[PDB]
Amino acid sequence: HFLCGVVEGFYGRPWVMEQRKELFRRLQKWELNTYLYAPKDDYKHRMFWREMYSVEEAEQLMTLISAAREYEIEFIYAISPGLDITFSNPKEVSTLKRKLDQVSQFGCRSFALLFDDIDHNMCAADKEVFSSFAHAQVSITNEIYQYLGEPETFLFCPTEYCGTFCYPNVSQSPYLRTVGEKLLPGIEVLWTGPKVVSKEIPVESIEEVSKIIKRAPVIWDNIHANDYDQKRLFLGPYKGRSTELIPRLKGVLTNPNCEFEANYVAIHTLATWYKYSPQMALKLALTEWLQEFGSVTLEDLQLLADLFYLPYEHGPKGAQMLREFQWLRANSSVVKIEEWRSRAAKFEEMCGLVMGMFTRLSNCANRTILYDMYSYVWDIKSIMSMVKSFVQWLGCRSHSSAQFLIGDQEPWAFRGGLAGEFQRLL
Amino acid sequence: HFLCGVVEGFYGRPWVMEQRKELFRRLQKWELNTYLYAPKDDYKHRMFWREMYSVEEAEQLMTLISAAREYEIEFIYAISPGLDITFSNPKEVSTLKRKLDQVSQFGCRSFALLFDDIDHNMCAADKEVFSSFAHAQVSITNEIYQYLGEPETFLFCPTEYCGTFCYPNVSQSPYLRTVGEKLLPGIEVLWTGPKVVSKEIPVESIEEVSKIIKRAPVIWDNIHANDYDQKRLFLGPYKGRSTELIPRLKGVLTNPNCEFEANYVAIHTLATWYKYSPQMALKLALTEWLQEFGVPHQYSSVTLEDLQLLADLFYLPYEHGPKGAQMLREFQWLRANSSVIEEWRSRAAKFEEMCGLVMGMFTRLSNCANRTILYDMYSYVWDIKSIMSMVKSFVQWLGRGGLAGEFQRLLPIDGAND
Numbered sequence: 001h002f003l004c005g006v007v008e009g010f011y012g013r014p015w016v017m018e019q020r021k022e023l024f025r026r027l028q029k030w031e032l033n034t035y036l037y038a039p040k041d042d043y044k045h046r047m048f049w050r051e052m053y054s055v056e057e058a059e060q061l062m063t064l065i066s067a068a069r070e071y072e073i074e075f076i077y078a079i080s081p082g083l084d085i086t087f088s089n090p091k092e093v094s095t096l097k098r099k100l101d102q103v104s105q106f107g108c109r110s111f112a113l114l115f116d117d118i119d120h121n122m123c124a125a126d127k128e129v130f131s132s133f134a135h136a137q138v139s140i141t142n143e144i145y146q147y148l149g150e151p152e153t154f155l156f157c158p159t160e161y162c163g164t165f166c167y168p169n170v171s172q173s174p175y176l177r178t179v180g181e182k183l184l185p186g187i188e189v190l191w192t193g194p195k196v197v198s199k200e201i202p203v204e205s206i207e208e209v210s211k212i213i214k215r216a217p218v219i220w221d222n223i224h225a226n227d228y229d230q231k232r233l234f235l236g237p238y239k240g241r242s243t244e245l246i247p248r249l250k251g252v253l254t255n256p257n258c259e260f261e262a263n264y265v266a267i268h269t270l271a272t273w274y275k276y277s278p279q280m281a282l283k284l285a286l287t288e289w290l291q292e293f294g295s296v297t298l299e300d301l302q303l304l305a306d307l308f309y310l311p312y313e314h315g316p317k318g319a320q321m322l323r324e325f326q327w328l329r330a331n332s333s334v335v336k337i338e339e340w341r342s343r344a345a346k347f348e349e350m351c352g353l354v355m356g357m358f359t360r361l362s363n364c365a366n367r368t369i370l371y372d373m374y375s376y377v378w379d380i381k382s383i384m385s386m387v388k389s390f391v392q393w394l395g396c397r398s399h400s401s402a403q404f405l406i407g408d409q410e411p412w413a414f415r416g417g418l419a420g421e422f423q424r425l426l
Numbered sequence: 427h428f429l430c431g432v433v434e435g436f437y438g439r440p441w442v443m444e445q446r447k448e449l450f451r452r453l454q455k456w457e458l459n460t461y462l463y464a465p466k467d468d469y470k471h472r473m474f475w476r477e478m479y480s481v482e483e484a485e486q487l488m489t490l491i492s493a494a495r496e497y498e499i500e501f502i503y504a505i506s507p508g509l510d511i512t513f514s515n516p517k518e519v520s521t522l523k524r525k526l527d528q529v530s531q532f533g534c535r536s537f538a539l540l541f542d543d544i545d546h547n548m549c550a551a552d553k554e555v556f557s558s559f560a561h562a563q564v565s566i567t568n569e570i571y572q573y574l575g576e577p578e579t580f581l582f583c584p585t586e587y588c589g590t591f592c593y594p595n596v597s598q599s600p601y602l603r604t605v606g607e608k609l610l611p612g613i614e615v616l617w618t619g620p621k622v623v624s625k626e627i628p629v630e631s632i633e634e635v636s637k638i639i640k641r642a643p644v645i646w647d648n649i650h651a652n653d654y655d656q657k658r659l660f661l662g663p664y665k666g667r668s669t670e671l672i673p674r675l676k677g678v679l680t681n682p683n684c685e686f687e688a689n690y691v692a693i694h695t696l697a698t699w700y701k702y703s704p705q706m707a708l709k710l711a712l713t714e715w716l717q718e719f720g721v722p723h724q725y726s727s728v729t730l731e732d733l734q735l736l737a738d739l740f741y742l743p744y745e746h747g748p749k750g751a752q753m754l755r756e757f758q759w760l761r762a763n764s765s766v767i768e769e770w771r772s773r774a775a776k777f778e779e780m781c782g783l784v785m786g787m788f789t790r791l792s793n794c795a796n797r798t799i800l801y802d803m804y805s806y807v808w809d810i811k812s813i814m815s816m817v818k819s820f821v822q823w824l825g826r827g828g829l830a831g832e833f834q835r836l837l838p839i840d841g842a843n844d
């Protein structure tokens with residue numbers, strides 16, 4: 001079968017169990033089938049990967065694995081040992097089996113070893129036994145694979161997991177060639193595309209990588225991931241991957257926004273795409289999303305998705321406001337002048353729709369959804385309001401010489417903190 | 427007695443019940459005495475203030491007020507009806523009493539009516555009855571006060587709640603004079619200082635406002651609030667308020683970061699101030715904070731310097747800590763003098779080793795046992811780490827923000843306070 005669902009694989013606060021049960025429910029309702037457990041900062045998954053689960057942790061984990069079974073969602077337990085594992089020490093290897101055996105006894109049948117986001121060097125001891133980094137990982141991955149009875153689904157995440165991370169390139173990487181040559185045929189290989197966050201995933205790039213890993217890979221997709229930028233959130237549709245990829249791929253697991261409720265559209269459009277027009281998929285997702293709010297209108301949600309769209313694209317309504325603002329600023333010296341004021345008034349009315357969107361979200365019944373998104377919505381509301389004020393100030397300069405900011409300011413007029421001060425020097 | 431503690435009075439996701447019980451414990455350990463319940467987006471507190479609590483909610487609220495009693499913390503229930511209340515409609519007024527009675531029967535003896543962050547205009551119906559906005563609030567506040575037997579603590583928050591919000595000024599505000607003249611003497615008045623986020627709260631400004639409201643005010647302090655800017659966090663010490671304020675004030679309730687665990691320093695130093703040097707207070711607070719950054723128990727870490735650095739990168743609304751200002755000055759100097767000789771490269775190396783200390787803080791925080799603490803602060807720390815690593819690479823080279831950011835960089839006031 002083709003694996004399609006969600007990987008919880010992002011940095012930061014992981015989802016809690018009640019949220020994960022809700023995700024299985026949603027995956028089944030939308031006819032997806034797979035969940036990959038890999039939250040980088042759930043401490044026993046990576047930083048303290050050798051440590052057994054406590055009695056209470058084990059009870060939560062089995063209750064969670066049962067919910068996946070109950071909802072016919074395949075539960076894939078990952079582990080990330082690569083920060084400090086000594087690959088050539090056999091108790092290290094046994095500690096890894098012991099760890100996986102424990103989760104086996106919770107009911108888990110599908111597993112993954114992750115070697116992403118780690119140094120490319122080995123310790124001294126390991127360099128004598130293995131001839132390269134690729135040798136050390138597939139050695140232990142094969143040994144683990146077979147040790148657990150050669151299971152239904154086993155995933156392997158390479159260190160060179162996207163186009164740009166391949167040295168020197170994809171076709172000639174001695175790491176990936178070793179992976180394809182020596183990783184056992186029943187083990188799957190994870191791939192994020194040409195980039196960590198791929199704008200597109202062309203099929204020629206998937207033929208290229210497939211040839212050297214001797215397998216169609218499973219896509220770990222970071223199109224909707226937002227752990228790398230506090231200010232960002234991605235409510236746009238799944239986009240940039242042709243449906244012609246489906247037969248050339250072993251699966252697609254989306255790594256979405258850290259805020260659980262913000263991923264309704266991210267997962268809905270992946271579902272629709274698994275059976276394609278991005279705009280039409282978005283309309284279906286936003287329409288269905290609307291009534292989990294009740295007040296908020298569809299037009300409000302259209303605007304909200306367009307302000308928080310995709311990593312390389314704003315939505316149409318967001319791009320327009322930005323163009324109008326750039327045109328207004330550039331042409332502001334003239335304050336024909338009747339066109340400037342006509343488009344300034346229209347621009348201010350669009351800012352009002354961002355204000356009113358925020359107001360109605362703030363009154364909605366689903367407080368869970370509101371809390372996941374509150375900071376993002378207040379962020380864009382307050383910047384739009386200062387932008388509206390700036391346009392009004394530009395229009396008033398034919399009858400005033402006052403500075404835009406007069407006098408002493410509250411701290412929010414100057415945005416970003418110390419991080420912001422560093423960025424502006426770049 | 428003089429009230430000193432915390433108001434949970436910020437916008438966005440409010441604290442949950444297990445977090446608030448933990449807050450009472452800390453307030454008691456540090457000899458503070460008061461908690462004011464006022465989360466702006468707890469829907470039954472403001473947006474849907476008329477609605478009664480369900481039985482599941484009533485059981486959580488009753489369990490929570492019991493903890494406040496158990497921990498000798500006075501529990502003050504606030505409610506914010508001012509967005510859409512019709513003051514002259516007695517059905518509105520009965521619903522307000524019916525709401526407070528319900529919470530009274532949960533064990534609550536102290537209450538507050540908040541009229542902050544609302545329009546200054548009234549509906550047509552109410553302009554018939556009341557001669558001004560201030561009259562309508564004082565009328566219903568007085569009515570609520572007496573209806574519940576004139577309780578020990580009752581607080582009233584004006585709409586003109588800070589110097590700059592007073593029209594035209596503090597001493598001549600028609601709104602505040604009606605409040606001082608007509609609000610019953612046993613009701614307390616909330617005030618945030620000259621500004622919403624006051625850098626200082628001078629003594630003369632408290633004299634000025636006290637004269638016109640006829641009573642010493644309770645300071646609602648937003649020095650550590652961080653709901654107004656996604657990117658900001660304030661781990662610095664309580665600062666800018668002389669202890670000479672204490673005899674002139676009815677109390678001090680601090681409105682701190684939304685991130686529960688980030689307010690150790692904010693509340694620890696308020697406690698220290700209540701019994702003063704901001705830097706000595708910070709050292710005591712960070713020292714004690716260090717002992718809840720454990721290492722997980724292993725069966726098969728954060729230093730004090732790490733925490734000093736973290737607080738100095740996320741310090742106070744109007745000043746960065748010393749170590750952050752230092753790195754920021756050095757970086758500007760390196761960029762400015764980059765047109766180039768051994769001085770440059772000598773200070774560039776020292777700058778990237780300071781960058782290394784940011785990374786090393788983040789790495790050790792990541793390994794700490796208290797995952798609650800890490801999660802509350804992760805995106806702030808993730809952010810500064812990855813930007814410093816890009817700054818470090820940029821310094822070597824010489825040898826984002828979303829749609830909001832794109833709009834921000836087009837404004838001329840971008841970086842204007844740098």
Ligand SMILES: CCNC1=N[C@@H]2[C@@H](O)[C@H](O)[C@@H](CO)O[C@@H]2S1
Pocket residue numbers: 009010011040116117157161190191192196220222225226227228255
């Ligand atoms: C399958 C490749 N492994 C990867 N580990 C990181 C993830 O944990 C992040 O969530 C993602 C986006 O910020 O960037 C990479 S991708």
Ligand SMILES: CCNC1=N[C@@H]2[C@@H](O)[C@H](O)[C@@H](CO)O[C@@H]2S1
Pocket residue numbers: 435436437466542543583587616617618622646648651652653654681
């Ligand atoms: C007692 C004055 N009322 C106020 N309501 C707002 C608070 O809810 C915010 O959290 C604070 C920081 O943004 O600024 C004002 S202060």
